[PDB]
Amino acid sequence: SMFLPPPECPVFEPSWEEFADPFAFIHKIRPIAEQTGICKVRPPPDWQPPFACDVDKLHFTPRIQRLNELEAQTRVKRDYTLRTFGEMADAFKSDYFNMPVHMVPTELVEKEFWRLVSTIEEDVTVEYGADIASKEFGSGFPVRDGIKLSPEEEEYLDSGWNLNNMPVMEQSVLAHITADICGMKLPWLYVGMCFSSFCWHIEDHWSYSINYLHWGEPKTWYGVPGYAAEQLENVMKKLAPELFVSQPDLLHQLVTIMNPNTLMTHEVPVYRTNQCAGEFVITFPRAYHSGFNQGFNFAEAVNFCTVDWLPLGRQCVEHYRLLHRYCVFSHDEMICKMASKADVLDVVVASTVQKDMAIMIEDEKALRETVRKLGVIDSERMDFELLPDDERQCVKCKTTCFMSAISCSCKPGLLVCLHHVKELCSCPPYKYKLRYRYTLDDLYPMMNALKLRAESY
């Protein structure tokens, strides 16, 4: 067996005026949608981006998936063409149900999915496609290519809802990141089949995500609001402890399939939706989500960060430190990069960055005072943004260092963040050097530039 479908998530149907600005729309729906974690957006009937591709020229390496509840799976970063994958996907679904592919009820596929993942006797293996856009397999949305585009492609080129543009818009904050973060700024393409699934997870740095289904059979989603994140994690720790062990890298992250009825039994609020072709699903910061595909389909997704997200982004990095989890980027480095470009920032963006920068400065001031009281006296300015990431992680908590770090000449290249001064080596702290990006005197004028920009209006 029995599956009790969770209640439906909110469905929004914006008008052309409401739809025009994705960021103003996401802010409007936020009080409702953040209570459910996920929501569905039906674009105006006439917003129809053109989907065109040669199924024989689009190639990808499929990923093999075992369908077992509570079994550890890895989040990862053979060859089929889109045609041969489709033939395989259709033959599979039609042979599974002994029915024509389009006649299988969605409620049946859902009930069946939850039955097959819980039955030990069932050894069902599926395949899917998951990767960033490339020359072998590109974006489902129109992109500018040096290739004459049709007027139908031209009108959707600059759309805020074309997922290639969403990151580089001025109401976004990940836009400004100069560092190589391919996984978080570039759209991901997903080629699905019946029962291929995405395990329970949250986005890196508790970011938002937006997902468009270009074509094919529906994608079923389950979502949990951000406020219930720790409640969900506590349920998962009891039922699957193996998933919560410390991992060697970000590549080695462990995720699992878990029946939403198990979460619902433990008082975790869960919402569902069937996303159909031409619809968007938006996930809110720290909102757990999972789901599976109903059949052969093609989706495109991207992470994004609004001004609303900035304080949660800072709380996330603090949460990664407590867990010894690797960061994708330095949150402080992003803030300082935006401060250095205060003159060209959006006014609402400058105002919000200024507020996070004030917290960063006061926390930094307190951390430096504490390390000075531990006996660290020597200091030297260091341009942390020039170091590759693997060369600036705290030995203890793995945090990406930017504002400051502690080094000792006895451990060349090793760094600790200012929370872990006692974890570097056995030398007395007078042998240490405080490496800093900026003095407090450099920071106050950077924050003032944001204030001037924000007060202009």
Ligand X SMILES: O=c1[nH]cnc2c(-n3cc(C4CCN(C5CCCC5)CC4)cn3)nccc12
68 marked ligand binding residue: no
Residues numbered 415 to 444 that lie near Zn ion (CB under 5 A) are: 417, 419-420, 425, 427
Please report whether residue 76 would count as binding Zn ion according to CB under 5 A: no
CA–CA separation, 260 vs 432, rounded Å? 51
419 and 371 in contact (C-beta within 8 Å)? no
CA distance 138 to 164: 11
Query: Residue 360 touches which of Zn ion, ligand X, Mn ion, none (CB < 5 to 8 A by kind)?
Result: none
Dihedral sign (CA 428, 431, 436, 439): positive
**Residues making up the chain, counted from first to last:** 457
Is residue 75 part of the contact set for ligand X (CB under 6 A)?
Answer: yes
338-397 residues near Zn ion, rule: CB under 5 A:
394, 396-397
From the list 11, 344, 366, 410, which residue makes contact with Zn ion (rule: CB under 5 A)? 410
Q: Is 303 exposed, middle or buried (0-12, 13-18, 19+ CB in 10 A)?
A: buried
297 interacts with ligand X by CB under 6 A: no
320 binds ligand X (CB under 6 A): no
Q: How many CA atoms does the CB half-sphere of 141 hold within 13 Å?
A: 26
Piece of the chain touching Mn ion by CB under 5 A; list 62-70, 87-95, 146-154, 374-382: 62-70
Nearer Cβ to Zn ion (45/412): 412
Contact by Cβ (8 Å): 126, 196: yes
Minimal CB distance to ligand X: which residue?
A: 198
The dihedrals phi and psi of 283, each to the nearest 5 degrees, come to -110, 135
Assess 318 for contact with Mn ion (CB under 5 A): no
> What ranges in 105-216 are assigned the alpha helix state H?
106-118, 151-154, 182-185
Question: 327 vs 185, 208, 357, CA distance in Å?
Answer: 15, 16, 19
128 is in an annotated binding site: yes
Residue 53, judged by CB atoms within 10 A of its CB (0-12, 13-18, 19+), counts as middle
Give the footprint of Mn ion on residues 103-122 (CB under 5 A).
119, 122
Toward ligand X, which CB reaches closer, 293 or 352? 293
Q: Which of Zn ion, ligand X, Mn ion, none sits in contact with 425, Cβ below 5 to 8 A by type?
A: Zn ion
Positions in 95-134 near ligand X (CB under 6 A): 130
Q: What is the CA 328 to chain-centroid distance, rounded?
A: 10
Q: Annotated binding residue at 201?
A: yes
Binding status of residue 174 toward ligand X by CB under 6 A = no
Binding residues (CB under 5 A) for Mn ion: these are 68, 119, 122
Binding residues (CB under 5 A) for Zn ion: these are 394, 396-397, 399, 408, 410, 417, 419-420, 425, 427
Binding residues (CB under 6 A) for ligand X: these are 75, 130, 183, 188, 190, 198, 201, 203, 211, 219, 289, 299, 301
